[PDB]
Structure formats: structure tokens, C-alpha cells
Amino acid sequence: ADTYAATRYPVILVHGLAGTDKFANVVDYWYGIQSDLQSHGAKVYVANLSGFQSDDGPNGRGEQLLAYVKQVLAATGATKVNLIGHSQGGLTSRYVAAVAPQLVASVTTIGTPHRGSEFADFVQDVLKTDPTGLSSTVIAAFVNVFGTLVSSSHNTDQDALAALRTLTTAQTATYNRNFPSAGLGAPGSCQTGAATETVGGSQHLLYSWGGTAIQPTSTVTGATDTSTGTLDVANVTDPSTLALLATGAVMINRASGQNDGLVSRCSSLFGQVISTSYHWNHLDEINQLLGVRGANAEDPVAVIRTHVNRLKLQGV
């Protein structure tokens, strides 16, 4: 054990997707990340949140996270925390930094759709005419795969789609207006904002990164998966690999540009962007499923570890 990742303030990992900190009630959402960071001296706490309504609604994920943050502080005697969120967890983290600015030292978002997801938009369009979504082979595939990851549910296939409602372009637009952030860039610029923000007289360090495995091609039509080789085992041992190429292809046909299967490069930009060139799909970002990634995908565990050291070096 060493102190490479020993930050001053505790680290809270904030999940996204359908709910809780587990996939199918048994697999850790942040696969293998907590034990790694702890072996490097970090104090890590993993949030467990629920709900499909907006992050700022009554008893919504935002309020749940805020309550959790206060329990962590009260138990540790620490005065602030470092928030690291994935997918919707980046939106959740934003709520806490906005309503209790004095309790947050930094906000890092990984593959967060700050400006919405074109796939979430597509699903909303289809259910307007096929309340089932199944007339779409892409939706069927998405549901089949992501339905198996839902924890604590009696209708996992339904819940798999429910998790996309808050990620639409329209919903995030509303959220961004009610919860502005210096970390966001100007509208329609596909540029990031400021590296820091001063809120309630508290300074926050702002960071982000995302994956761009899915690239547009002139010829799955119109898209290619750059995370995998020719004959890649990740295409077999991880069912989310081809599922996210399919959803990413839909995104590209909806003018998203390069993406991770659910979040475009432009939508992910927030604060200081470490990189968006990682050859990752949305689940590779969190070492899923079960540590499986394509031959061209970088090590996500190493990437996160290096970032917690980065925080330490910044004094948080």
C-alpha cells in the first residue's frame, strides 16, 4: 500500500444508469476501482442512489447524494469531498456542488451527457408512436443487454429504458438553465468552459473526460468501433460492446459526431477536459463489463488512479 492516491479530502464515486451501486444486484458498478484506489491510500466512499426523475426533484438523486455527503463529513470530521461521477452521476454531482458549494472541493465527470444524449432522444421519439420501442432492433438490443444490469427491479427491461428519460436533450437543457456552471461552454460551441468556478465563495476544481470509440464512416451503417480489433474477444465476452456500437450508430445518424455509444464528445465537455480520445465505449469508462475492453482500449483503472493522484497534487 502507498499514498499515491492519498488526497486531502475523501473521494466519493457517484454512479449513473438505472440505480444503486451494483449491476444485477451483485456486481460493483465501479469494477475493481475502489480496491485499487484504497491500496494507494485514498479514502473512497461509493454512493448508492435511486430514482428516474430529475436530479433536482424532491427526494431525487441530488438530495440523496447531498444527504450522503453530509453523513460522510460527519463521520470523517472532513470539511469537503471530491466528487467523481459517471454518466448521470456527473449531473447528480453538479446538483450538490450548486446547492452546498462549501462541502465540495472538486467535481470530475466521466462520460456525462451535460448536453443530452441523441440515443435518449431517439428512444423518446420512438415511444411516441411504438410505446414498446421494439419496432427498433437497436432499442431491442439495448434493452436486452442493459435490462440484465438492472438491480432491485421487477421489470428490468422497462427500467433499462426509464434510466434514459433524464438524459434527453430537452431535459438537460432545462437542468442546465436551473443549475448553471462556469464549467460549461457556450451553447452550440462544442467547447468546454472554465477549469474552476467560485460559488458561495468556495473554489471548485472542474474536470472531465470521455470516450470516442464510435466513429463515423462514409459507409451498422455509418459507424465503426475503434476500441476493438478484427477478431476481438471483447465482442464475445462483453455483450455491451456490440450493443454500444449499434446505439452509437444511431447517435451518428442523429448528428452526434464521435461518441461512446450513449454520450457524444461535444456533450461530455466540462471544466478542464483531460482527454476525449480514449478508445472507449460508455461501460469501458468504468471497467465494465467485468473488466472486459477491446484490444485498442486504454486501461480505465490506471486512468482513474492517475486522476486521483492529480487531485492530490492540486491540494485537494
Ligand SMILES: [Ca+2]
Ligand atoms: Ca467493455
